[PDB]
Design a protein around this ligand. Sequence first.
Ligand SMILES: *[C@@H]1O[C@H](CO)[C@@H](O)[C@H](O)[C@H]1NC(C)=O
Ligand SMILES: *[C@@H]1O[C@H](CO)[C@@H](O)[C@H](O)[C@H]1NC(C)=O
Ligand SMILES: *[C@@H]1O[C@H](CO)[C@@H](O)[C@H](O)[C@H]1NC(C)=O
Lengths: 29, 476
Amino acid sequence: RFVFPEPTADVNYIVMLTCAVCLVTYMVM
Amino acid sequence: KYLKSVLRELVTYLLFLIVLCILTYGMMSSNVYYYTRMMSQLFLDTPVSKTEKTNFKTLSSMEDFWKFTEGSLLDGLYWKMQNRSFIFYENLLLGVPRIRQLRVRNGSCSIPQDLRDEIKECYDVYSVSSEDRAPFGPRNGTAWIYTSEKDLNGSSHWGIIATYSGAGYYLDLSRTREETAAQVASLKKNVWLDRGTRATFIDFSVYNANINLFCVVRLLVEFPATGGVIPSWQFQPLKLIRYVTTFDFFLAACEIIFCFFIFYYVVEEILEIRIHKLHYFRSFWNCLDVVIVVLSVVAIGINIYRTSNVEVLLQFLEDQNTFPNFEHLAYWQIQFNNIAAVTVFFVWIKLFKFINFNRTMSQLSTTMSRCAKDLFGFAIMFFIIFLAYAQLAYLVFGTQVDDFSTFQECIFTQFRIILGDINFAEIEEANRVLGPIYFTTFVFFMFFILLNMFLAIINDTYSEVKSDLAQQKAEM
Ligand SMILES: *[C@@H]1O[C@H](CO)[C@@H](O)[C@H](O)[C@H]1NC(C)=O
Ligand SMILES: *[C@@H]1O[C@H](CO)[C@@H](O)[C@H](O)[C@H]1NC(C)=O
Ligand SMILES: *[C@@H]1O[C@H](CO)[C@@H](O)[C@H](O)[C@H]1NC(C)=O
């Protein structure tokens, strides 16, 4: 059931922010 | 000895510098500014009609665009000679203009069921996933039928709002005003710019045989999904028949010499990698030669690419009744100009390596080198608070001020505040309570509390360095 949507040219900020925080909290740690 | 190594590297660099400066003088001529200035004044800075006073750069409605198209546009393109058209009796209009439209389809968006009764149709914002591809209106010609990007030889543009495609509904105007006016009137009659249009481009080019220099023109008005019109323009003076005069041969010889110098620098920099020390990148004087070499190689490659694909000119010259597609060369010209400018800047910066001829310059160089770490340590703490202020301004004022409309605009506005350029006459009405507080607190905490630490650090380091080198001499 793997699909290849690519339906938008926009960006979701929630995932980017969550990943950035989860990486900075690892670098400082 | 040691005098035969620091002097050879100087003479092999001064020749490089003079060759680069010769090329730089060769590129930027003084006959270019006035060409663009007159064209821009002719097309952007004239009223659409004798009654109205709205020129191109102040369009505010879709109906004003139709006044511009059959109006100050045709009034500038077609001139009667004192058949072909000479725009200023000097600049030849070669080919025919093209006008192209980008539109979306109804139902690309969803209106909520609660108010679905009053809203009939909606059109989404522009995106390639939601772009109309079906015939509309009277399906007779090529202005009402979608044509692919590959069938137009088009490319993206990166407008102000979005990044538009190269495919759409296009129509080629005529060689004479009496036919172009009829074509545009027919386009206006059967509505061609409805609510679904998202962009509209106009392209043409000129020659001006007096000085061998083309000039490509692109005019863009984009209608966002929230209403309004956003105009934009671009004039680029190309040059495609370069090998005409003796100075052109001299410049070609200079480019060949520059290529040889870059090859020499590549070999003489790779000689100091494996034959000698490796991973010697804590110098800043060998991390800058790699930048120069890389940028010069990129510039050479870009020039070869943009001069090895000139088939558009020959294709147009074979049949001179069609649209000359010069919009690709005008992009690589811009990229080449940017790369050459940056390379020249860095080559000029590299001169600091060779000014240590006496003590009064070595002292300043040491003072600059010893305070770099402290300045870098403080710059982080400065810029964190700077970015905090920028984001606060963006979130609070970033909807109604224009100057804080985007993050970059916030950064540049704060820099101009530091310069003391902009004043808070418009911030206050955006927010009565946080208008003056932001301005006064920003000035107080970034003009003479955190801005004076750089001065303190630099003064203290200079005094320390001078004292140390003076005490070093006090034992002879
Ligand atoms: C577009 O589609 C909607 C239905 O989704 C319809 O109500 C509307 O009339 C259509 N627009 C035109 C111009 O026909
Ligand atoms: C297409 O344009 C022609 C131009 O004469 C005219 O017949 C009409 O406006 C359009 N429709 C058809 C079917 O030709
Ligand atoms: C695109 O380029 C080809 C030449 O490769 C040319 O024949 C064709 O007419 C061009 N497209 C248009 C719409 O003129």
